[PDB]
Amino acid sequence: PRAPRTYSKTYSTPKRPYESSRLDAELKLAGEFGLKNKKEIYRISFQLSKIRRAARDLLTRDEKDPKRLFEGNALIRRLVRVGVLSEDKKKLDYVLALKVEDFLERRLQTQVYKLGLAKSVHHARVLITQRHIAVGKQIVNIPSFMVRLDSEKHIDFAPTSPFGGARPGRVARRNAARKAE
Template structure:
C-alpha cells in the first residue's frame, strides 16, 4: 500500500521579521527545541484546531454535529493539556496561541 503524505508545518510568509525571530528564539531556548520547524509545526497544528472550531461555531448551537464534534475537540485538547477544564468552550479554543 502507498502512504499519503501531508504537510506538517508551514513556513512564515516573511522570513526575516525581527519580532517573530526574537519570539521563536525565546521559545527554542525555553523549551530546548531542535529547530524552528518544531515551532512552525505546533503553530500549524493549532491553526488547524482553530479552523475546526471556527467551522463548528458557524453551525447552530443545537446542531448535533456541533455538539458531538465540538465536545470531542474540547475533550481532546483537555486530555493533551492544551486547554483547562475550566475553559471547556469553543470560544476558548479560538484564543489558543503558541
C-alpha cells in the same frame, strides 16, 4: 500495484519568515523550551492553526447543530485530555484562545525539566534521547512526546537506566575496573 499509503506534511513555512518580531518570538520560544530548530516551532504553529481554524468553522455553525455539538465536544475532549485546555474552560471560545506556548508546555522535555529530573531543558533533552526517561513502564526517547494528564504523574527514570536502579553505565564500570586494577 499495492494501494497507496497516505502521507502529509506536519509543518508549513509562515507567511512572513522575515518579520523581526517573529524572529524574536522564535528565539524566545527556542531558548525557553530548548528547541533544536525553527521547524519545531513551525510544526506546532501549523497544528495550532489547524485546531483554531476548525474551532472557527464549528463556531460559524448554528448552536445545537448536531455536527457542531459532536465535533466541538470531541475537540474539547481531546484538548482537555492532552492537557492544553483546562477542565473549567470547556468551550470552543476558549479553544480559540489557545497559544503555542501551551503546546510547548506539554512536551515531555519541558515536563521532565519541571518535575525536577533535569537541571536544564537541554539536560532533559539529553536524558530523553539517551533512554533514561520512562512514561509508566515504557521508555520514551522523543522530546516532542506530548504528555497527557494521566501520564504526567508516571514520568520517572527507566528501570534499565543507571539512574533508575540498573547497573552503572560503561564509563562508570570502566573507571571502576581501571581503579581496581
